[PDB]
Design a protein around this nucleic acid. Structure first.
Lengths: 129, 152, 67, 56, 185, 70, 132, 53
RNA sequence: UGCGAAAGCAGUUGAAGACAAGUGCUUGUCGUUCGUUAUAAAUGGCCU
């Protein structure tokens, strides 16, 4: 359940957070690496932030916030940024997507997509018989 | 390693801070202390659990004010052990008041579930029989008690 | 008069019964009492449960739309 | 107990002390008799639910 | 300043952070210099979820200001603690207290946050890793906490003993930080 | 018409009264009335006959995170 | 039985004062009373009126030997508790308070009579032994 | 074991001692001895199960 | 809330101002006042 930040040039630990109560199955990052989002079996999403000016000089990450959005494990998570779009898409054993906003993660609104959205129908009905 | 035997008989100052080892605490106590209300109830009804110890973990939860809280996430599969003990606890004088308390709550909290589950319905008929039998015994005791007052 | 706030009056009768003692009481009168007190107990029990009572998806189903 | 009290009623009356020599009876009987109002309250609730689902 | 609802002074005694109804707005001012002068409405710090929920979430019951003026802790009756980085008004939530938090105090350096509430448990929040250490089963609820010493040798606490509803029965504790044991009760 | 969680009916002989989590779409994609939300989620909706409407509806252990209740 | 139910059904609509007489009719039996309450009492007003009449009748004399009224009360509370408490009338609550007073005066009796009942039981056996 | 004298307040003298145990002792500097026990690691008890070094 | 036994016996829960939300109207709120004896719900549980 630990998220650890290693320095690449020296291959040594810089910070250790005991965040989750179970595995951390996925990670994702913002374009500028101002946010690191984790998720796993504990059904939570944790945000880690370095966006503060004093932090960036000190490159210390801060366990900013966490949320409970999923009914079961979170296996896959991904993040996209653009001048018009800011998505944090997550999904897992619950078989559904959850869409959040990276920049406003702690306070922003979230949408829970339908489990089945029949664009391609799997059922037909015959009027006769 | 030759120093462990020494008890400091020749030393100026003797300083002891070790806290005495306390008896290991049972599982149900661990759950109350960690605020595991529901589990503390389950540990109450396990095979080979001394009757006196079980009566406590019912009393502690009532004293803590956690009776409904311990009975929320339950169905007929996991409610049966509580009733089975209650089926036996109702007889003894000591636990009669406590079982009277818990039995009332589960009815107030699982009236609807009771209708659709046939097993629970039998548990209540059998319970209804024995609580009735207890009334008769208590009523007899009163008549004896009145009988004695006449003699004295 | 009994057999023909009632709390203390009954409790007073219990005092009468004890003072009379074992020897003095008479069987014929006793049975009339024995019947009366049983009626009261049956009533006395009866009010009690009254008092306590006062203190106390389908796979396929048919439905018509509202249009 | 009922028969002992009945037959030897006269002798028991003429005893210097009864509470000391029959303390255990009073202790036992008092414990049961105290439970009666609580049990009746339990009985009434059970009849309420038992009547309910039996009708349903 | 007008219509001040709540106020606090840094551990050094050089910064004053207070809330005024000009709903409410928090301003921090340096006392012996004009170096620090910041203000912002409470709306910015408050999340939107707490805006949806009841009033207990938007109601502050304790406040604290870091010595350097970089961090400010706000308590809420809901039991949440919100640390605000003054430089850019960024929020960080620390949520352990089930009931209202009554005492907040930063340490001298700023790395540790002493918190106390109705739980009768003192919590030292380690802000580097957001961990915590506890001093539980105190004699009463902690009205106040502080770090009293050049090197944080002693923690000074005020306890209430809310059991006695007739009177307010305060008890002052001074704990040794080395082993968290009552140096003076 | 019907979607994942809504069913509707539009009568094409009548004109109507005039009276965040997606791309803002500043870029180009390339280069009489009835509405209900009671039934959901829907797999497929169709009529059996002139007055029978067929609505088809959908009917695992997870890590325990308790909800405190006092 | 059927005639009384329809007769009772009519008076409850008519707000007649003879509701107590219809309820007290000896033709009533326990399964019928359950049937009547389930099948005919479909509106809160009828539930209230019957409860009012029964509640007042019992409170005025909780010691009547005639078990038909209490038998009515027991089944009304047993079956329609959810609908009864839904009634928010102040007057309805006040009647319950009086009724709770009248009944509870009994339950304090019971330990006394059972005490009396024991003594008579001893006394009866005393006479039997002497006779033999 | 080792003596310790604070680099600023020269009057401060203290003795730190440790063993194959989970607590460290500190003796500030004669009827009695002022000895303090360090036995809290603040969330890192896993990494440290003995102070002996 | 008053009296009293613990049981109960009587009696209450009013008015103004302001803000927020939806659409001048509706509802909810009060670190605002006057007067009368007068559900909860930020995933949030206690050291060595």
């Amino acid at each position: 359940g630990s998220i650890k930040f290693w320095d690449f040039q020296f291959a040594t630990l810089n910070q250790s957070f005991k965040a989750h109560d179970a595995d951390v199955l996925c990670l994702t990052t913002d374009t500028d690496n101002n946010y690191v989002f984790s998720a796993g079996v504990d059904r939570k999403i944790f945000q880690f932030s370095q966006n503060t000016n004093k932090s960036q000089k000190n490159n210390r990450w801060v366990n900013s916030s966490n949320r409970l959005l999923h009914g079961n494990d979170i296996r896959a998570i991904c993040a996209y940024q653009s001048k018009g779009a800011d998505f944090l898409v997550s999904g897992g054993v619950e078989k559904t997507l959850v869409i959040n906003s990276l920049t406003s993660f702690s306070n922003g609104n979230y949408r829970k997509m339908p489990t089945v959205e029949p664009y391609s129908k799997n059922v037909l009905v015959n009027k006769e018989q | 390693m030759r120093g462990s035997e020494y008890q400091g008989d020749q030393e100026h100052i003797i300083h002891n801070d070790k806290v005495r080892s306390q008896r290991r605490m049972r599982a149900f106590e661990r759950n109350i202390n960690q605020f595991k209300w529901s589990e503390a109830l389950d540990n109450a009804f396990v095979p080979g659990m001394a009757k006196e110890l079980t009566l406590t973990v019912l009393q502690e939860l009532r004293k803590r004010g956690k009776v409904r809280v311990a009975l929320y996430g339950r169905d007929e599969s996991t409610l049966e052990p509580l009733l089975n003990w209650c089926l036996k606890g109702i007889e003894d004088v000591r636990s009669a008041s406590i079982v009277a308390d818990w039995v009332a709550v589960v009815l107030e909290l699982y009236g609807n579930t009771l209708e659709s589950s046939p097993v629970l319905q039998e548990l209540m008929i059998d319970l209804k029989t024995k609580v009735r039998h207890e009334i008769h015994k208590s009523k007899e005791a009163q008549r004896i008690e009145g009988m004695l007052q006449l003699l004295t | 008069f009994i057999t023909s706030q009632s709390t203390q009056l009954f409790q007073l009768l219990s005092l009468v019964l004890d003072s009379i003692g074992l020897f003095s009481l008479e069987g014929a009168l006793l049975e009339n009492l024995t019947l009366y007190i049983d009626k009261q107990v049956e009533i006395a029990e009866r009010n009690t449960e009254l008092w306590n009572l006062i203190d106390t998806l389908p796979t396929y189903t048919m439905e018509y739309l509202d249009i | 107990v009922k028969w002992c009290l009945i037959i030897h009623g006269g002798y028991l009356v003429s005893i210097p002390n009864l509470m000391s020599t029959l303390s255990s009876l009073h202790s036992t009987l008092k414990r049961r008799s105290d439970l009666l109002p609580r049990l009746l309250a339990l009985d009434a609730r059970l009849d309420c639910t038992i009547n309910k689902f039996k009708t349903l | 300043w007008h219509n001040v609802i709540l106020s606090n002074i840094s551990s050094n005694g050089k910064l004053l952070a207070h809330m005024c109804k000009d709903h409410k707005s928090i301003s921090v001012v340096s006392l012996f210099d004009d170096s620090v002068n910041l203000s912002f409405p409470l709306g910015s710090i408050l999340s939107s979820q707490t805006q949806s929920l009841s009033y207990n979430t938007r109601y502050v019951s304790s406040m604290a200001i870091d010595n350097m003026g970089q961090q400010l802790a706000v308590g809420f009756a809901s039991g949440v603690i919100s640390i605000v980085s003054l430089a850019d008004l960024q929020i960080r939530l620390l949520k352990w207290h089930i009931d209202s938090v009554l005492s907040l105090s930063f340490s001298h350096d700023g790395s540790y946050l002493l918190s106390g509430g109705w739980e009768k448990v003192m919590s030292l929040w380690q802000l580097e890793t957001n961990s915590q250490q506890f001093l539980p089963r105190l004699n009463g609820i902690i009205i106040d906490c502080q770090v009293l010493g050049p090197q944080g040798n002693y923690y000074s606490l005020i306890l209430q003993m809310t059991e006695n509803n007739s009177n307010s029965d305060y008890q002052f504790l001074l704990l040794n930080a080395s082993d968290l044991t009552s140096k003076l009760s | 018409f019907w979607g994942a969680t809504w069913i509707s009916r539009i009568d094409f002989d009548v004109d109507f009264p005039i009276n965040g989590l997606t791309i803002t779409d500043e870029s180009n994609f390339m280069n009489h009335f009835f509405f209900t939300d009671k039934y959901k989620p829907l797999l497929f909706v169709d009529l059996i006959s002139s007055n029978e409407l067929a609505i088809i509806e959908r009917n695992q252990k997870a890590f325990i995170q308790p909800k405190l209740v006092f | 039985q059927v005639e009384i139910a329809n007769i009772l059904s009519s008076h409850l609509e008519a707000n007649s004062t003879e509701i107590l007489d219809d309820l007290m009719s000896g033709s009533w039996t326990e399964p019928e009373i359950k049937k009547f309450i389930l099948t005919k009492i479909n509106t809160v007003d009828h539930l209230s009126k019957i409860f009012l009449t029964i509640s007042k009748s019992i409170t005025q004399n909780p010691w009547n030997e005639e078990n038909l009224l209490p038998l009515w009360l027991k089944w009304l509370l047993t079956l329609k508790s959810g609908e009864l408490n839904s009634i928010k009338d102040k007057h309805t609550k006040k009647n319950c308070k009086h009724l709770k007073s009248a009944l509870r005066s009994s339950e304090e009796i019971l330990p006394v009579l059972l005490g009396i009942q024991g003594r008579l039981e001893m006394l009866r056996r005393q006479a039997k032994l002497r006779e033999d | 074991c080792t003596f310790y004298t604070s680099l600023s307040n020269q009057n401060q003298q203290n003795i730190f001692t440790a063993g194959r145990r989970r607590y460290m002792h500190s003796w500030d500097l004669s009827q009695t001895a002022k000895i303090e026990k360090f036995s809290r690691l603040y969330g890192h008890e896993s990494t440290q199960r003995s102070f002996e070094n």
